[PDB]
Amino acid sequence: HPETLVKVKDAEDQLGARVGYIELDLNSGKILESFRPEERFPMMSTFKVLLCGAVLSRVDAGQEQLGRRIHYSQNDLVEYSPVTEKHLTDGMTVRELCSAAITMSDNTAANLLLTTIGGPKELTAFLHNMGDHVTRLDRWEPELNEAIPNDERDTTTPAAMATTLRKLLTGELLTLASRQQLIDWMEADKVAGPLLRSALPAGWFIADKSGAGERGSRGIIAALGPDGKPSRIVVIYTTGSQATMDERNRQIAEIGASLIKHW
Ligand SMILES: *[B]([O])([O])[C][N]C(=O)/C(=N\OC([C])([C])C([O])=O)C1=[C]SC([N])=N1
Ligand SMILES: [K+]
Ligand SMILES: [K+]
Ligand SMILES: [K+]
Ligand SMILES: [K+]
Known part of the structure; x- marks a missing residue:
């Protein structure tokens, strides 16, 4: 609704920095509303959903197992590792790492999965x-969050990310049970x-993934809708704000x- 764009563009004014926004119909793919939808923004941790999509695609292909255990150690740990820092002795499974990375x-979970x-x-x-001929990951944690102005490394666009998320969650890209596991990880959140x-009303569903990085970068990807069922995807990014x-x-x-x- 254009009234939502009153708020999106106000956010860009208030933050002193670009904002990108997409609302998509999950079923049809129709673009319901947008703002800077084909401009690049740093993904930050929103990439972790894509990552666990790629992992699940390997699982489906018989190239990975969700129960496979990875052992790691102190030196592997990078900044902000609240789950993995607790499991040095005995490691974590691939599903546990995707749970940690997404939820x-x-x-560190993201690096191990990468x-x-x-x-x-x-x-x-x-x-x-x-x-998706747009989205690209180039670096590892921590550097992928550096949000350098004009850098295309580690970026997406609102439109590309929303399109890709729709595919991963609902297309034949992943098996049903796996696309369900991806959305289930996204439904959990801390x-x-x-x-x-x-802002979400009682009874509504949401499955999301946030991001934060350098230079004020912040964002979220989500599938949401009423009565326990998602029906739209929203993608919001910003970078450059102080x-x-x-x-x-x-x-x-x-x-x-x-x-x-305005739903
Ligand atoms: B991802 O974008 O969610 C990973 N985020 C980070 O590594 C950053 N912040 O994460 C914490 C510590 C949880 C936070 O307080 O937002 C981060 C990377 S670079 C930067 N300035 N902040
Ligand atoms: K419109
Ligand atoms: K170890
Ligand atoms: K221990
Ligand atoms: K989540």
């Missing part, structure tokens, strides 16, 4: 091969509460309040 945004598929370059190849979830985390969070939550009101 907690654990950064290693399984061949690194960033292979995530990019996976994306290209599913018809870190995106201040974002769309804070605002506080709370200020960026609130702008995203206010975009969410608006898109709910």
Whole structure:
């Protein structure tokens, strides 16, 4: 609704930085509303959903097992590893690592998972091969969050990300049981509460993944809808703001309040 765009563009004004926004119909793929939808933004941790998509694609292909155990150690740990730092002695399974990566945004979990598929370059190849000729991962944690102005490394566009998320969650790309496991990880959350979830009515479904990086970068990808069933995808990104985390969070939550009101 154009009234939601009143709020999106106000966010860009208030944050002093670009905002990108997409609302898509999940079933049809229709673009319901957008703003800077084909401009690049840093993915930040929103890539972790894509990553676990690529992992699940390998599982489906008999190239990976969700129960396979990976052993790691102190030196592997990178900044912000709230789950993996607890499991050095006895390791974690691939499903446990995707759970940690998506539900907690654990950064070491993401690196461990990235290693399984061949690194960033292979995530990019996976994306290209599913018809996303835009999104690219180039680096590992921590550097992929650096959000350098004009850098295309580690970026997506709102439109590409929304399209790709629709494919992963609902297309023949993954088997049913696996696309369900991807959305189930996304339904769990300990870190995106201040974002769309804070605006979500009782009884509604959401499956999401947030991101935060350098230079004010912040974002979220989500599938949401009423009565326990998702029916739209929303993607919001911003980069370049000098605002506080709370200020960026609130702008995203206010975009969410608006898109709910005008649903
Ligand atoms: B992902 O974008 O969710 C991973 N995020 C990070 O590594 C960053 N922040 O994460 C915490 C520590 C949870 C936070 O307080 O937002 C991060 C990377 S670079 C930067 N300035 N913040
Ligand atoms: K429109
Ligand atoms: K170990
Ligand atoms: K221990
Ligand atoms: K989530």
